[PDB]
């Protein structure tokens, strides 16, 4: 009796669920570096000159 | 007796569902950085110029 019983009738069928999650999660870097440099140069000049003024 | 009755001569499924879901995602990131520049420099030049002139 009652209305349970249509649940009976039709073959129901009730699904329920839970998802329950964590995480945790720590990254850590170190980093180093190192550079040099050297440079070295060298420059050469030459002129010449003529001039020739007649007044 | 009723229209019910149909349901039943062709077989009827009546599926549902429903999935509620939540997330919360918390990141924190600390950086340190520590340079140091050393530079020499150095440089040194010569110049010879003569000039002669006639009047």
Redesign the interface.
């Known amino acids: 009796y009652g209305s349970d019983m249509y649940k009976y009738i039709e073959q129901v069928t009730d699904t329920q669920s839970q998802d329950l999650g964590k995480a945790i999660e720590n990254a850590i870097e170190q980093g180093q570096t190192k550079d040099r440099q050297q440079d070295k140069?060298h420059?050469e000049?030459k002129?010449y000159?003529d001039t020739i003024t007649k007044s």
């Open positions: 140069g420059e000049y002129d000159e």
